[PDB]
Write a structure and sequence with these properties.
2 copies of one chain form a homodimer. By secondary structure, chain A is an alpha+beta fold. The first copy, chain A, folds into 3 domains: about 110 residues, Thrombin, subunit H (Beta Barrel); about 80 residues, Trypsin-like serine proteases (Thrombin, subunit H, Beta Barrel), CATH 2.40.10; about 100 residues, Orthogonal Bundle (main proteinase (3clpro) structure, domain 3). The first copy, chain A, is about 20% helix and about 25% strand. Chain A is built from 8 helices and 13 strands. In chain A, the strands form 2 sheets. Chain A has a 7-stranded antiparallel beta sheet, with no helix packed on it. In chain A, strands 8, 9, 10, 11, 12 and 13 form a 6-stranded mixed beta sheet that branches. In chain A, a hairpin with a 2-residue loop joins strand 2 and strand 3. In chain A, helix 3 packs parallel to helix 6, helix 3 packs across helix 7 and helix 4 packs parallel to helix 7. The longest helix of chain A is centred in the last third of the chain and has 14 residues. Chains A and B meet through helix 1, strand 9 and strand 10 of A and helix 1 and strand 10 of B. Bound molecules: the ligand C[C@@]1(C(=O)Nc2cncc3c2CCCC3)CNS(=O)(=O)c2ccc(Cl)cc21 (2 copies) and chloride ion. The PDB classes it as viral protein.
Chain lengths: ~300, ~300
Amino acid sequence: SGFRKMAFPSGKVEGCMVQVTCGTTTLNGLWLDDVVYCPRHVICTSEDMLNPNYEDLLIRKSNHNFLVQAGNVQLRVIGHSMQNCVLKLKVDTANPKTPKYKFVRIQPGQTFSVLACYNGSPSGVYQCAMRPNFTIKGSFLNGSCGSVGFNIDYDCVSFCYMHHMELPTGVHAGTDLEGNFYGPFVDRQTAQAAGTDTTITVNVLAWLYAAVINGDRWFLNRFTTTLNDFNLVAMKYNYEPLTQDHVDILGPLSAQTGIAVLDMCASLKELLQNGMNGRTILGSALLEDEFTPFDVVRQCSGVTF
Amino acid sequence: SGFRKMAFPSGKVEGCMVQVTCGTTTLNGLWLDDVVYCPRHVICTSEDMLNPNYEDLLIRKSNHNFLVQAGNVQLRVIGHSMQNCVLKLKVDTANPKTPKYKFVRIQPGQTFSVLACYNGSPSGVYQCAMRPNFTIKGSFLNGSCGSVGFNIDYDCVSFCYMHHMELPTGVHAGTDLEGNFYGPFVDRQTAQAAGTDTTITVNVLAWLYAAVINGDRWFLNRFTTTLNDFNLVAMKYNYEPLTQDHVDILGPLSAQTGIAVLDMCASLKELLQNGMNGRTILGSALLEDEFTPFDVVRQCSGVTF
Ligand SMILES: C[C@@]1(C(=O)Nc2cncc3c2CCCC3)CNS(=O)(=O)c2ccc(Cl)cc21
Ligand SMILES: C[C@@]1(C(=O)Nc2cncc3c2CCCC3)CNS(=O)(=O)c2ccc(Cl)cc21
Ligand SMILES: [Cl-]
């Protein structure tokens, strides 16, 4: 029993973290085989960020201008290239601790573990979700750039995020491991703001099913709803529209508990209208949206209480 | 910016997890040097749990009755002994991945990371606190016994908890690595319950300071209070008494924000007597008590390992 925001064991990623230095800037890199991946803004000064010409800044660099440190060993850079917003530094040593891995681009609503790093050294691990506005609510200080997001289903590490930026509201933006940013963000200091964020409806429903599996049913009601009527109510509370794909994905949780998806939608409608009345659901006084249906299945017992 | 429930990087502990089997029972073990540490109830059947005589059950077992598996390699047990509620299995192979470590007993209010394991394989990592009633609010299913709790200090892993039991309310109980239980619990199937719990006051204050560091100031006021008047209010809301030691420990957070500890106590007094009035603090509608003053300092500073 119990339900916690759980991250994947970070050991396989810890063995890939390195420090990348270019001039006076120092950040983190990800060392997989003989390549170190890091944000391309490592070659920028603060003044360069207003309007950087990365192609012009990069051509003035040689391999020996990049210092890569793995633990207390200096790696040697033997090539460099830029792919979108990431820099790929070819090194003379393949990482002997390289795990089985894949690069995957995720969709909003999907969760992942973040290994926060400073100076190539891991400091902590926490669970995050890609918000509908393509930002993440992380915990990052100066020096955390290059820290990565990942999932580890089986023994394979699926890298999905690399940290690049903090926005004015304290939320974070980054790229996939091919250097493509999530959202309309750019690696330039310009008027960039997080768009209006919304609640990940399919994840709230998944967490209500987790509460039922763990033994709580107080929030259920005798009503049902059509999918369109539920969406008309949901959008009034800044909740994301629920699609047929989301209803399909909730199928296994619906079968394990015996509660139809549109009947759980009716409980969600009532909870939005009434609040909790001094009660909690899985130790929370707010409706939780950073657990996917897959996360609930992974953590919860296969037997409902 | 940002504030997340952060766990320590789990890599150093992942390299110590093994599977221990005795008869039909299978659980987790911690392999450090040539010793595997696991709950002594591994030698019990369901019938033996009603009233076990561990010395009598153990004398009937030989070294070859214990199956220890580290990955896909079978370790050989060459000796066995019992220390309190922990079994120590001497193996023929020293763990080449043994980190720098210590066994430390923690006090209620202290936090630690848990690496949840099943069949000697790590599945997740999460943060939790030792409650004043000596239980932890963990997330564990059948097979999780032997999973460990820890903190990291530079290069050194301080093991503080080993999982043994789930109580009727869904909360958990266990021992330190010397086999001494936290709380008045016993390792047998009998009527045991979590006592009435209380809120960890020094941790709520630490989290209010974290909210001020991150830009949440609505709860501050012009008032102050004394230790005695604050404790008279706290006792009424099932909050732990605040001591001069707690005030001293909150010193660095008080200096960083410019808010005296008794000044912050006056803000908590008003939150206890009036509530949040539809507002949140660091994304929560409840007063969070599972972040110590040291956890707030570490997360708002970037301490690496
Ligand atoms: C490198 C930087 C950034 O966001 N750093 C950072 C990234 N994560 C967290 C924290 C920071 C800063 C301090 C608080 C914590 C610098 N600011 S910027 O507006 O010029 C900018 C603009 C675009 C990009 Cl891709 C990066 C940056
Ligand atoms: C081994 C067991 C235990 O709590 N297992 C367990 C531990 N963590 C989680 C979950 C369980 C069980 C199933 C639900 C989830 C079994 N119950 S018991 O009352 O006989 C008992 C009594 C004393 C001790 Cl030290 C252990 C146990
Ligand atoms: Cl996805």
